[PDB]
Amino acid sequence: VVDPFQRKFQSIGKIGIDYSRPKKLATYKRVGYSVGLDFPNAVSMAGHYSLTDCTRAGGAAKILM
Amino acid sequence: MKSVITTTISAADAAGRFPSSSDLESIQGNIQRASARLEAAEKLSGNHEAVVKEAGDACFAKYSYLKNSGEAGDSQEKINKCYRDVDHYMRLINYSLVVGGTGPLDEWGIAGSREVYRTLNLPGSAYIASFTFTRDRLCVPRDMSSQAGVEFVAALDYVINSLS
Amino acid sequence: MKSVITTTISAADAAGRFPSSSDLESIQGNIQRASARLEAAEKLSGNHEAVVKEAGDACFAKYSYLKNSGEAGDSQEKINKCYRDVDHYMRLINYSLVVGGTGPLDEWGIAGSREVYRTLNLPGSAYIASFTFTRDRLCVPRDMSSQAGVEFVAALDYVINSLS
Amino acid sequence: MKSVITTTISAADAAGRFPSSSDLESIQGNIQRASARLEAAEKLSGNHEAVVKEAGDACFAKYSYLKNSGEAGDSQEKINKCYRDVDHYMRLINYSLVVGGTGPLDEWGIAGSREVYRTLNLPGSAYIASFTFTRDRLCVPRDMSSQAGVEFVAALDYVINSLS
Amino acid sequence: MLDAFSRVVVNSDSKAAYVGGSDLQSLKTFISDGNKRLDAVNCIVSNASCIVSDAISGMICENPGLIAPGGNCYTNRRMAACLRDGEIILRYVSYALLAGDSSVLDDRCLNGLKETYIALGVPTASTSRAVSIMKAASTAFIMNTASGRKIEIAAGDCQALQSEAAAYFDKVGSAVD
Amino acid sequence: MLDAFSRVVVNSDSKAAYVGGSDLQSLKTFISDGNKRLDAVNCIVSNASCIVSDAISGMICENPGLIAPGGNCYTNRRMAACLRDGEIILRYVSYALLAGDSSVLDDRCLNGLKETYIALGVPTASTSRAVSIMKAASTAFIMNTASGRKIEIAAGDCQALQSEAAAYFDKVGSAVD
Amino acid sequence: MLDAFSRVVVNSDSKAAYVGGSDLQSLKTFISDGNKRLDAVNCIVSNASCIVSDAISGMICENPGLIAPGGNCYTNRRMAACLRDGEIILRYVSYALLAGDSSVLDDRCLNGLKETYIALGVPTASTSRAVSIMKAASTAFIMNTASGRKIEIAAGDCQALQSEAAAYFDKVGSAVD
Amino acid sequence: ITLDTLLYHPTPTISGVEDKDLICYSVWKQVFGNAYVMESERADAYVPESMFRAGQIPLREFVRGVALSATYRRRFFECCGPYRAVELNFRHLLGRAPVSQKEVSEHIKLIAAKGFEAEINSYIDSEEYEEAFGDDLVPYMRFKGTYTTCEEFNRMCTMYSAPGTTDKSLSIRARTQGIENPNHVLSLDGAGVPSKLVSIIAMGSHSSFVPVKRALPSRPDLEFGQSTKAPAQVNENANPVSRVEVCMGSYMYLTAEEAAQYNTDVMEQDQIASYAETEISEAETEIARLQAKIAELNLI
Ligand SMILES: C=CC1=C(C)[C@@H](Cc2[nH]c(/C=C3N=C(/C=C4\NC(=O)[C@H](C)[C@H]4CC)C(C)=C\3CCC(=O)O)c(CCC(=O)O)c2C)NC1=O
Ligand SMILES: C=CC1=C(C)[C@@H](Cc2[nH]c(/C=C3N=C(/C=C4\NC(=O)[C@H](C)[C@H]4CC)C(C)=C\3CCC(=O)O)c(CCC(=O)O)c2C)NC1=O
Ligand SMILES: C=CC1=C(C)[C@@H](Cc2[nH]c(/C=C3N=C(/C=C4\NC(=O)[C@H](C)[C@H]4CC)C(C)=C\3CCC(=O)O)c(CCC(=O)O)c2C)NC1=O
Ligand SMILES: C=CC1=C(C)[C@@H](Cc2[nH]c(/C=C3N=C(/C=C4\NC(=O)[C@H](C)[C@H]4CC)C(C)=C\3CCC(=O)O)c(CCC(=O)O)c2C)NC1=O
Ligand SMILES: C=CC1=C(C)[C@@H](Cc2[nH]c(/C=C3N=C(/C=C4\NC(=O)[C@H](C)[C@H]4CC)C(C)=C\3CCC(=O)O)c(CCC(=O)O)c2C)NC1=O
Ligand SMILES: C=CC1=C(C)[C@@H](Cc2[nH]c(/C=C3N=C(/C=C4\NC(=O)[C@H](C)[C@H]4CC)C(C)=C\3CCC(=O)O)c(CCC(=O)O)c2C)NC1=O
Ligand SMILES: C=CC1=C(C)[C@@H](Cc2[nH]c(/C=C3N=C(/C=C4\NC(=O)[C@H](C)[C@H]4CC)C(C)=C\3CCC(=O)O)c(CCC(=O)O)c2C)NC1=O
Ligand SMILES: C=CC1=C(C)[C@@H](Cc2[nH]c(/C=C3N=C(/C=C4\NC(=O)[C@H](C)[C@H]4CC)C(C)=C\3CCC(=O)O)c(CCC(=O)O)c2C)NC1=O
Ligand SMILES: C=CC1=C(C)[C@@H](Cc2[nH]c(/C=C3N=C(/C=C4\NC(=O)[C@H](C)[C@H]4CC)C(C)=C\3CCC(=O)O)c(CCC(=O)O)c2C)NC1=O
Ligand SMILES: C=CC1=C(C)[C@@H](Cc2[nH]c(/C=C3N=C(/C=C4\NC(=O)[C@H](C)[C@H]4CC)C(C)=C\3CCC(=O)O)c(CCC(=O)O)c2C)NC1=O
Ligand SMILES: C=CC1=C(C)[C@@H](Cc2[nH]c(/C=C3N=C(/C=C4\NC(=O)[C@H](C)[C@H]4CC)C(C)=C\3CCC(=O)O)c(CCC(=O)O)c2C)NC1=O
Ligand SMILES: CCC1=C(C)[C@@H](CC2=N/C(=C\c3[nH]c(C[C@@H]4NC(=O)C(C)=C4CC)c(C)c3CCC(=O)O)C(CCC(=O)O)=C2C)NC1=O
Ligand SMILES: CCC1=C(C)[C@@H](CC2=N/C(=C\c3[nH]c(C[C@@H]4NC(=O)C(C)=C4CC)c(C)c3CCC(=O)O)C(CCC(=O)O)=C2C)NC1=O
Ligand SMILES: CCC1=C(C)[C@@H](CC2=N/C(=C\c3[nH]c(C[C@@H]4NC(=O)C(C)=C4CC)c(C)c3CCC(=O)O)C(CCC(=O)O)=C2C)NC1=O
């Protein structure tokens, strides 16, 4: 169907359609929304975050970054 | 049939360990609250018929349209199904009242009620009218002790919160 | 940290339901056996040093070869590790004695003991000699309430059955 | 019964593929070290009774309190259980010595030893005293072919590291 | 998972000593106050679904933008999950009422919830409003001051325990922000 | 899973009526006898591993064919599983001692135990022997007549409860045959 | 899983040949009759829950031993599972109404059901009675002869298809015995 | 309602060290299908426990890590038939019955292509796994009212059998292999006997009902209700003379009153018999006398 990796990268669906079994809070902490950042252009924004993670997907801290 | 002792035995079984002092304290509390539960069960076995009679009469008292067409208890037979079902309710409140957990009341009466009630067009609110009638009506010192009355009220409250 | 209330909270959580009357009866039993547990904890906090002293002295009394070469506590330092470890044991018996379950005693002292004991060449039977000896030493009545002596013996029995 | 050929057959089976040249080289090494293993098995089958006799006598020589009372077997029958169990140990060292892997020694003697030893109050360190006696004793050349000696020592070392 | 008992134990382990008279004394006050605590738990349990209904309906009433089309309370399924979550929040608050120590709620449900509701776009101030409604509702049931409820129990002081339950609700509503 | 409470309940459901005075009366005798029951459970728990060790070692002693090569007790792993099964049998017997109704053991462990033994070639008479040793051992601990154990508890009558525990062991040993 | 199309295919594969004019001809009669078949499916779907309610309530009415205490319809949970199973049986009958070949029902639901209801103590004659009530109910809806239902569709002959649906119900009720 | 509520498996979200211990223990039930794992086999799949108790690796992957270990492998992959490997690996992890020949044949075409590890990755990384239970619970006895094939419930309940029972069939294994003595058989192996399902899988029919009954959890209304009923006395005064025993061949005849009197007598001299431990404790006081000699030797 869909390769496991891409599923780790992809968004957590909704409960009423995408999954019957209600997810817990740690699984939003572990995968969630995963998007990497462009390389930033000033001294002020450079040191605070990794541009992107590879073979890893964080979730909902990436929203705040 | 969740009770004190079934929970602790199932839990110590889930650990796979022998029952430590904790479970022993739990069943110690079971034989503490036992006397109040059983006194309530004795008086419930005393006058259950008038309990069901007042409950059903109050139920048709609040809602007259149960005897309207053809939507509900429009025969003497279906009103016999009414006092029949409330007899089962007081029978389960007696059973769970003896056990001291909601377990037999849960597994026999509660589980899957809402599918039957939505399917055979039975509104739950009329049952709530009956139980809240027997809820409002309970005596303060006059028949049973506060624990006996409290225990009864608690069990019936569980019924209401599980019904709707 | 298995106790009455941790078991019932974990169990009603495992059902995902509100705490019914059963759990309330369980913690009612917890405050029943509370006074005997805490009396035992008070006296244990009283004279723990002489308890560990008699336990260790009896432990080397039964087995002299602990001070033989080079296999065991052949220094004053390692005998200080002896009374040190029995201080930890009485500290955990105090803790579980306060809690009323074997939980903190289990998770802090018991779990994975046998790997350390087989690895650092520590025979468990000497510990069993210590616990058993103190066990006999405690008074039936004079030193604590009848329920309390029992509570202490029960906890220490758990230690023995978990040790070997 | 892990050996060379059982590992390679199980591994190429786990791939689901035909045995390539790698496995053939592995069993080639098995028939290389074969002669030294089997020579050790021949001499072990030679004088096993005096091996068990010196091992058990050294075991009670290091620890006298085995015949103290109930801590250790104090009967002639339980010392017959002693030389019995060391006969089983040398029997398993013979078997694994023939196989060339620790497998039959592992699955028959090693697996789950520590539960029985902690349960029936058997201290492992006395077994270690026996095996380290037979370990120290080997004279290498003049007792047997030097290489066989290494094989024997290796097997017995595995026993010690698996025991405690 | 901690009991108040176990909280005293872990304090004694960090102090590395035995129990001592003062911690035992405060724990004796806990045990003597325990029956009031159990009665409070029975009060909050016996009206729980009703509290959830009134609290969530009041949350929708104080701002109808949630039921306005496109909002989170706007749809039928999402309303079901709304009632479900209010029920579960009330459930762990009740568990904290038996326990007397917040650590069961702190490690069970309070952990990761803020970043979940951020991860789903659930408005946090509306949730804290619902937690506030269950706070005042639970204190009104805990003091028998409900306008449609009357328990028949002997009078006494329980205001410390009321402030305890309000501390749990303010912990949740503080931690979902 | 039944309690003795729940056994009275199911009897009342098969009778289709309420509880009635007699069943309540016998249940009152259960509750008044309950502390002896808990004390008995504490006795059997506090010496459990020791009972298992002595019982299984006595089973091996009464016939050394089990440890004779080819037998089931003959090997190290299979001896570990032997001690394990004796421990678990004692565990469910203890659960039946708290419950006062055998239905937990009847549906949990007694069901299919015989079939498992038949499948494994485990000699059933030897198992029933081990259950008999745990029977007399458990009655000796339950009456404080152990030759190396002395509990310090007020004297009274518990022979009905001793016969109860012997009824559980005879149920197991009857049902493993 | 077979269609009537696929049933013709498997017949041609067992015959090892091509399709031939006769099987195509009968399949043309199927296609020309197909819209009546779809209309029949819409009729049985549009009153399905109602059929299940009336059929199961009539099953309880024709013998009140089921609701008598100890019976299978006697309890609340078990009544829920009763309504559920009647719904699912009606569901696979509807699938056989679209398919025109019974093999989907034969391999999906009809297989192992008899030995399941034997394995649970469900009375088979009562189940076959419920299947009979859904049979006559489904034929009454399929011929618009319901006493409280009137569809507005052009008149035509469908008695072959009515006998087809009755053949499915008689297959189920025959195979649950 | 599917009968899941009658059964009881807890798995809490990980809050303390306790919850970690219960969850680990329940996993090694379910992965091994109640097989007995000793210390060394406990120490086989170690590394997944550390990565799970650290919480760095989720729960389905702890289950994968335990399934990939050598012990589970040698029991349930190695010394089983190819089918038997498939429905065992299928029972432990997905907890169902193989639905059809295609499903099992596709797994076996996957084993001939790739072998065991890519299989276990197929069972874990299947979707029906993940939506059935994913990182939340441990595998368990699946009840679901909607069943893809009514046969699913049926063959799954034949897979499970009794709650007390386990998979090994030495006697079954013993007869087919040429061994007179079953216990003479290696016990590390044993999960491989004929595949119980495959008759029903290939033919698609007539699943037995006796096997199905065992697996049913015990129903509080039905099977408990028939079991106990011994009530009342027809006479207020019936005196039976029953027989008690005071050895193998020595036999007493008493009535209930008189037997009660006899037993009370046995209690009267049972205090007398239990006197002996005071002699034991007094004799132990003598240890103190021995110690006094040690005290004298220290003072000399
Ligand atoms: C302005 C430019 C700019 C960058 C280019 C990054 C570079 C960068 N990356 C990290 C930090 C990191 N970067 C990575 C990335 C990696 N993960 C892997 O598996 C791969 C080897 C690699 C991606 C290809 C990881 C994993 C961390 C966290 C490392 C850790 O905490 O162990 C940090 C430390 C601060 C932090 O934790 O975010 C910095 C400065 N940050 C910046 O400000
Ligand atoms: C929280 C609970 C807790 C315990 C119960 C102890 C248990 C314990 N004891 C030792 C370690 C030790 N324990 C002893 C004790 C013994 N000396 C003997 O003669 C007797 C057999 C025995 C006392 C009855 C000795 C001698 C050591 C040091 C062993 C060595 O270094 O050889 C160690 C290793 C670390 C160390 O060296 O201290 C640990 C974990 N520690 C804990 O944290
Ligand atoms: C917290 C728990 C706790 C206990 C259980 C006790 C245990 C205990 N008992 C004694 C001490 C003692 N205990 C006893 C008791 C005995 N007399 C006999 O005839 C019997 C064998 C036995 C009662 C059954 C006696 C006689 C002493 C004094 C011994 C002596 O000085 O010779 C001591 C030494 C300190 C002292 O002299 O009091 C201790 C620690 N103390 C504690 O703090
Ligand atoms: C196939 C390999 C194999 C072994 C290696 C043995 C290992 C073994 N030994 C014992 C059992 C025993 N083993 C010993 C031996 C000891 N006596 C002591 O003084 C010393 C510490 C030690 C000898 C060095 C004793 C005394 C027992 C009986 C223990 C008891 O009943 O208290 C048992 C339990 C069953 C029994 O009672 O026989 C087992 C499995 N058995 C096997 O099947
Ligand atoms: C198993 C369930 C279970 C319960 C639910 C309780 C219910 C309960 N509460 C009390 C008893 C009590 N309960 C309260 C509680 C109150 N204080 C107030 O200010 C409020 C009105 C209210 C808390 C909301 C008080 C104050 C008492 C003592 C009353 C008194 O002695 O005057 C008693 C009498 C015994 C005792 O004194 O403890 C009982 C049975 N007990 C149980 O076993
Ligand atoms: C143990 C504690 C515990 C909780 C507290 C909840 C918290 C929680 N809520 C949701 C999920 C949800 N929660 C709500 C609730 C809301 N609807 C609104 O209009 C309001 C803003 C709000 C009620 C006040 C909704 C609507 C969803 C579904 C969101 C969506 O799918 O869009 C989810 C994701 C999984 C799911 O879909 O169910 C979780 C973890 N779950 C738990 O396990
Ligand atoms: C939480 C744990 C816990 C326990 C372990 C028990 C322990 C215990 N047992 C008794 C009390 C009792 N226990 C027994 C038991 C005995 N009968 C005999 O023949 C044997 C010697 C022994 C069983 C092996 C008897 C007979 C009494 C009543 C004694 C009497 O009144 O004379 C009492 C006093 C209160 C009562 O009368 O019930 C207590 C606290 N209670 C608890 O709360
Ligand atoms: C819930 C209840 C419950 C039980 C009652 C047991 C029953 C049981 N025992 C064994 C398994 C076993 N049981 C024994 C026990 C025996 N050794 C002998 O010498 C005697 C004949 C007998 C003790 C009296 C042995 C030796 C094994 C292992 C057999 C083998 O592998 O050869 C197994 C197979 C799984 C395993 O290896 O552990 C099972 C299901 N298990 C359960 O889950
Ligand atoms: C794919 C096809 C398919 C089916 C055909 C059903 C068949 C079926 N029914 C039940 C289960 C059940 N089925 C019924 C039904 C009955 N109630 C009675 O009064 C009558 C005798 C009968 C309706 C005519 C009941 C009551 C149960 C629950 C039985 C119980 O728990 O006691 C179960 C066990 C699981 C469960 O509890 O749901 C199964 C597999 N399920 C499927 O997946
Ligand atoms: C997508 C959904 C969908 C449907 C549900 C059907 C509905 C439908 N049925 C018919 C048409 C028809 N439907 C029927 C069916 C009936 N015969 C009787 O005896 C019964 C009353 C009834 C079956 C229960 C008949 C007989 C016709 C032809 C009517 C005529 O030509 O006289 C037509 C007109 C076109 C045609 O002739 O096929 C349509 C749209 N078509 C669709 O596209
Ligand atoms: C595959 C490789 C691999 C590793 C290398 C380990 C690494 C590792 N160690 C721990 C965990 C641990 N590791 C140690 C070890 C230490 N004790 C100290 O005094 C020293 C600082 C240090 C030894 C030198 C301790 C004590 C813990 C438990 C920590 C705790 O629970 O507080 C954990 C968390 C899971 C667990 O509790 O086991 C992990 C992943 N695990 C693996 O899977
Ligand atoms: C039209 C949309 C709408 C609602 C829905 C309600 C919801 C609501 N209930 C309140 C508060 C509230 N609700 C209840 C519970 C409730 N009352 C009882 O007597 C019983 C038996 C109850 C459950 C059935 C209590 C007990 C209070 C406290 C006020 C009081 O004393 O009644 C409050 C006040 C909040 C605050 O103080 O900040 C609101 C907004 N209001 C709305 O505008
Ligand atoms: C030589 C091979 C051999 C054995 C091994 C023993 C095993 C054994 N123990 C028994 C019975 C038995 N065993 C114990 C347990 C045991 N005793 C204690 O006081 C403590 C602390 C124990 C564990 C360490 C008790 C308590 C009894 C009951 C008899 C008694 O009062 O001592 C019985 C009697 C069984 C019966 O009554 O039917 C036997 C056969 N016998 C043998 O012939
Ligand atoms: C007193 C105990 C009792 C019952 C309960 C009924 C149950 C019942 N319904 C029938 C049959 C039946 N039932 C319905 C369904 C039903 N009718 C509708 O119009 C709507 C909307 C319905 C659900 C609310 C239909 C449509 C039929 C077919 C007959 C008809 O045309 O009405 C039949 C005939 C069975 C047969 O043909 O073999 C029976 C026995 N009968 C009883 O004696």
PDB file of all heavy atoms in Angstrom, chain B residues 133-146:
ATOM      1  N   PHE B 133     -37.795   9.439  40.218  1.00  0.00           N
ATOM      2  CA  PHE B 133     -38.879   9.424  41.188  1.00  0.00           C
ATOM      3  C   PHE B 133     -38.497   8.619  42.435  1.00  0.00           C
ATOM      4  O   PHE B 133     -38.693   9.082  43.559  1.00  0.00           O
ATOM      5  CB  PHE B 133     -40.157   8.882  40.582  1.00  0.00           C
ATOM      6  CG  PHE B 133     -41.286   8.845  41.549  1.00  0.00           C
ATOM      7  CD1 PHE B 133     -41.916  10.025  41.929  1.00  0.00           C
ATOM      8  CD2 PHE B 133     -41.706   7.640  42.106  1.00  0.00           C
ATOM      9  CE1 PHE B 133     -42.948  10.004  42.842  1.00  0.00           C
ATOM     10  CE2 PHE B 133     -42.735   7.617  43.017  1.00  0.00           C
ATOM     11  CZ  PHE B 133     -43.358   8.798  43.397  1.00  0.00           C
ATOM     12  N   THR B 134     -37.934   7.436  42.233  1.00  0.00           N
ATOM     13  CA  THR B 134     -37.471   6.643  43.369  1.00  0.00           C
ATOM     14  C   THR B 134     -36.228   7.260  44.004  1.00  0.00           C
ATOM     15  O   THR B 134     -35.916   6.983  45.161  1.00  0.00           O
ATOM     16  CB  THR B 134     -37.168   5.207  42.947  1.00  0.00           C
ATOM     17  OG1 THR B 134     -36.144   5.226  41.950  1.00  0.00           O
ATOM     18  CG2 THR B 134     -38.399   4.556  42.364  1.00  0.00           C
ATOM     19  N   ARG B 135     -35.539   8.115  43.249  1.00  0.00           N
ATOM     20  CA  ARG B 135     -34.379   8.817  43.777  1.00  0.00           C
ATOM     21  C   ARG B 135     -34.817   9.928  44.702  1.00  0.00           C
ATOM     22  O   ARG B 135     -34.293  10.061  45.806  1.00  0.00           O
ATOM     23  CB  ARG B 135     -33.561   9.391  42.637  1.00  0.00           C
ATOM     24  CG  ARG B 135     -32.284  10.106  42.995  1.00  0.00           C
ATOM     25  CD  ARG B 135     -31.750  10.685  41.704  1.00  0.00           C
ATOM     26  NE  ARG B 135     -30.533  11.460  41.878  1.00  0.00           N
ATOM     27  CZ  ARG B 135     -29.909  12.077  40.881  1.00  0.00           C
ATOM     28  NH1 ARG B 135     -30.397  12.003  39.634  1.00  0.00           N
ATOM     29  NH2 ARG B 135     -28.804  12.768  41.133  1.00  0.00           N
ATOM     30  N   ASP B 136     -35.783  10.738  44.267  1.00  0.00           N
ATOM     31  CA  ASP B 136     -36.226  11.884  45.066  1.00  0.00           C
ATOM     32  C   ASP B 136     -36.929  11.440  46.337  1.00  0.00           C
ATOM     33  O   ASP B 136     -36.792  12.069  47.382  1.00  0.00           O
ATOM     34  CB  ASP B 136     -37.136  12.792  44.243  1.00  0.00           C
ATOM     35  CG  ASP B 136     -36.376  13.540  43.149  1.00  0.00           C
ATOM     36  OD1 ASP B 136     -35.158  13.818  43.302  1.00  0.00           O
ATOM     37  OD2 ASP B 136     -37.004  13.861  42.112  1.00  0.00           O
ATOM     38  N   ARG B 137     -37.652  10.328  46.225  1.00  0.00           N
ATOM     39  CA  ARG B 137     -38.489   9.735  47.269  1.00  0.00           C
ATOM     40  C   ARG B 137     -37.823   9.037  48.471  1.00  0.00           C
ATOM     41  O   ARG B 137     -38.481   8.785  49.482  1.00  0.00           O
ATOM     42  CB  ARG B 137     -39.483   8.761  46.591  1.00  0.00           C
ATOM     43  CG  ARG B 137     -40.328   7.933  47.543  1.00  0.00           C
ATOM     44  CD  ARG B 137     -41.247   8.828  48.355  1.00  0.00           C
ATOM     45  NE  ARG B 137     -42.375   9.329  47.575  1.00  0.00           N
ATOM     46  CZ  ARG B 137     -43.610   8.876  47.711  1.00  0.00           C
ATOM     47  NH1 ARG B 137     -43.850   7.881  48.560  1.00  0.00           N
ATOM     48  NH2 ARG B 137     -44.590   9.352  46.952  1.00  0.00           N
ATOM     49  N   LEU B 138     -36.540   8.719  48.381  1.00  0.00           N
ATOM     50  CA  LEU B 138     -35.901   7.959  49.459  1.00  0.00           C
ATOM     51  C   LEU B 138     -35.944   8.679  50.822  1.00  0.00           C
ATOM     52  O   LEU B 138     -35.790   9.906  50.916  1.00  0.00           O
ATOM     53  CB  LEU B 138     -34.459   7.595  49.076  1.00  0.00           C
ATOM     54  CG  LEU B 138     -33.507   8.736  48.703  1.00  0.00           C
ATOM     55  CD1 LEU B 138     -33.272   9.699  49.849  1.00  0.00           C
ATOM     56  CD2 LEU B 138     -32.183   8.180  48.231  1.00  0.00           C
ATOM     57  N   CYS B 139     -36.145   7.896  51.871  1.00  0.00           N
ATOM     58  CA  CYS B 139     -36.243   8.423  53.244  1.00  0.00           C
ATOM     59  C   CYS B 139     -34.906   8.909  53.818  1.00  0.00           C
ATOM     60  O   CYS B 139     -33.843   8.390  53.494  1.00  0.00           O
ATOM     61  CB  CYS B 139     -36.792   7.375  54.196  1.00  0.00           C
ATOM     62  SG  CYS B 139     -38.464   6.815  53.844  1.00  0.00           S
ATOM     63  N   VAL B 140     -34.997   9.903  54.676  1.00  0.00           N
ATOM     64  CA  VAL B 140     -33.825  10.502  55.318  1.00  0.00           C
ATOM     65  C   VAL B 140     -33.372   9.805  56.639  1.00  0.00           C
ATOM     66  O   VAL B 140     -32.282   9.278  56.661  1.00  0.00           O
ATOM     67  CB  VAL B 140     -33.951  12.028  55.422  1.00  0.00           C
ATOM     68  CG1 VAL B 140     -32.750  12.605  56.147  1.00  0.00           C
ATOM     69  CG2 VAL B 140     -34.043  12.641  54.042  1.00  0.00           C
ATOM     70  N   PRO B 141     -34.181   9.778  57.731  1.00  0.00           N
ATOM     71  CA  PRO B 141     -33.806   8.761  58.739  1.00  0.00           C
ATOM     72  C   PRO B 141     -34.760   7.590  58.809  1.00  0.00           C
ATOM     73  O   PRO B 141     -34.449   6.613  59.503  1.00  0.00           O
ATOM     74  CB  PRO B 141     -33.912   9.542  60.049  1.00  0.00           C
ATOM     75  CG  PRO B 141     -35.117  10.388  59.809  1.00  0.00           C
ATOM     76  CD  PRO B 141     -35.076  10.780  58.351  1.00  0.00           C
ATOM     77  N   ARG B 142     -35.850   7.617  58.030  1.00  0.00           N
ATOM     78  CA  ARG B 142     -37.091   7.038  58.476  1.00  0.00           C
ATOM     79  C   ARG B 142     -37.119   5.511  58.329  1.00  0.00           C
ATOM     80  O   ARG B 142     -37.761   4.803  59.111  1.00  0.00           O
ATOM     81  CB  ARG B 142     -38.244   7.742  57.749  1.00  0.00           C
ATOM     82  CG  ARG B 142     -39.678   7.218  58.009  1.00  0.00           C
ATOM     83  CD  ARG B 142     -40.289   6.325  56.921  1.00  0.00           C
ATOM     84  NE  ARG B 142     -41.733   6.718  56.711  1.00  0.00           N
ATOM     85  CZ  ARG B 142     -42.570   6.285  55.778  1.00  0.00           C
ATOM     86  NH1 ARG B 142     -42.227   5.353  54.901  1.00  0.00           N
ATOM     87  NH2 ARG B 142     -43.808   6.778  55.741  1.00  0.00           N
ATOM     88  N   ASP B 143     -36.385   4.988  57.371  1.00  0.00           N
ATOM     89  CA  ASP B 143     -36.404   3.557  57.138  1.00  0.00           C
ATOM     90  C   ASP B 143     -35.061   2.852  57.330  1.00  0.00           C
ATOM     91  O   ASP B 143     -34.972   1.915  58.110  1.00  0.00           O
ATOM     92  CB  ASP B 143     -37.020   3.285  55.772  1.00  0.00           C
ATOM     93  CG  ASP B 143     -36.376   4.102  54.676  1.00  0.00           C
ATOM     94  OD1 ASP B 143     -35.421   4.839  54.982  1.00  0.00           O
ATOM     95  OD2 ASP B 143     -36.830   4.037  53.519  1.00  0.00           O
ATOM     96  N   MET B 144     -34.044   3.354  56.646  1.00  0.00           N
ATOM     97  CA  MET B 144     -32.714   2.778  56.662  1.00  0.00           C
ATOM     98  C   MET B 144     -31.716   3.848  57.086  1.00  0.00           C
ATOM     99  O   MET B 144     -31.997   5.050  57.019  1.00  0.00           O
ATOM    100  CB  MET B 144     -32.328   2.287  55.262  1.00  0.00           C
ATOM    101  CG  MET B 144     -33.478   1.769  54.428  1.00  0.00           C
ATOM    102  SD  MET B 144     -33.121   1.826  52.669  1.00  0.00           S
ATOM    103  CE  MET B 144     -31.674   0.775  52.597  1.00  0.00           C
ATOM    104  N   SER B 145     -30.534   3.405  57.490  1.00  0.00           N
ATOM    105  CA  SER B 145     -29.467   4.314  57.899  1.00  0.00           C
ATOM    106  C   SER B 145     -28.888   5.055  56.697  1.00  0.00           C
ATOM    107  O   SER B 145     -29.020   4.623  55.545  1.00  0.00           O
ATOM    108  CB  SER B 145     -28.352   3.548  58.621  1.00  0.00           C
ATOM    109  OG  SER B 145     -27.614   2.748  57.708  1.00  0.00           O
ATOM    110  N   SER B 146     -28.190   6.150  56.965  1.00  0.00           N
ATOM    111  CA  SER B 146     -27.608   6.974  55.907  1.00  0.00           C
ATOM    112  C   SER B 146     -26.724   6.190  54.932  1.00  0.00           C
ATOM    113  O   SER B 146     -26.810   6.359  53.732  1.00  0.00           O
ATOM    114  CB  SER B 146     -26.828   8.134  56.514  1.00  0.00           C
ATOM    115  OG  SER B 146     -27.690   8.960  57.293  1.00  0.00           O
TER     116      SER B 146
END
